[PDB]
């Protein structure tokens, strides 16, 4: 079957990329170091930015369950690609360090 193009990321609760899987190059055309330290919202279409912010805000409230969002992500070639991001929080349960967000980011169709 045709494997969807996707990559994993980790974000702080504000949306900053703190880890980026190198499959990002194939998915959106950036090297990991072009994403790391930036907010995901900096890659998001203006119409979808607030949705994406509010998704990040809520996913910490959902008891670790997955929250999905579809948004337009600006590729390295400055083109809008539809991405479905599936996100959930994690915290090492032996700690009280602040949760972070793990995302799977897949290029999908809007059709």
């Amino acid at each position: 079957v045709c494997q969807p193009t996707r990559f994993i990321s980790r974000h702080n609760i504000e949306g900053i990329f703190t880890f980026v899987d190198h499959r990002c190059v194939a998915t959106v055309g950036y090297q990991p170091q072009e994403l790391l330290g930036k907010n995901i919202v900096e890659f998001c279409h203006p119409e979808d930015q607030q949705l994406l912010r509010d998704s990040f805000q809520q996913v910490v409230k959902l008891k670790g369950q997955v929250l999905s969002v579809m948004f337009r992500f600006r590729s390295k070639n400055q083109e809008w690609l539809w991405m479905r991001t599936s996100s959930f929080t994690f915290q090492n349960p032996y700690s009280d360090e602040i949760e972070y967000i793990i995302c799977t980011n897949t290029n999908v169709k809007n059709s």
Binding site: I8, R23, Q65, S68, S86, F88, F90, N92, I102
Partner: protein, 114 residues
């Protein structure tokens, strides 16, 4: 002593638990390079005494969508095993609830024991 970040590694699997991605934090923990895991089932690496439990865990994960494993032992590259726990989450297609892959957050609980 190691800090928390160093004792976690993320992995992605197909629905049969074959590795499709692993972060490089695994190497310092138990020796493997990510590239050598790809296409191998996680089941190859489970201790014999944890195998039936991990099969049940996987079934529960596929039924429920998200599970925390029991403690289990994972075979290290150079011998011995490390105690792990894994939180698994199925990633779907929202359209039709078709499963796409399994995202695992793996955290160690011991040094390599042999």
């Amino acid at each position: 002593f190691k800090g928390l970040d160093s004792k976690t590694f993320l992995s992605e699997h197909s629905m049969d638990m074959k590795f499709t991605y692993c972060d490089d934090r695994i190497t310092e923990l138990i020796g493997y390079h990510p590239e050598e895991l790809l296409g191998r089932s996680a089941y190859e690496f489970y201790h014999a005494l944890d195998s039936e439990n991990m099969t049940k865990s996987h079934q529960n994960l596929c039924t429920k969508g998200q599970v925390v494993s029991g403690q289990y032992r994972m075979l290290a590259k150079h011998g011995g095993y490390v105690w792990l726990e894994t939180q698994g989450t199925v990633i779907y297609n929202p359209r039709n609830l078709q499963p796409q892959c399994i995202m695992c957050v793996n955290y160690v609980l011991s040094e390599i024991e042999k």
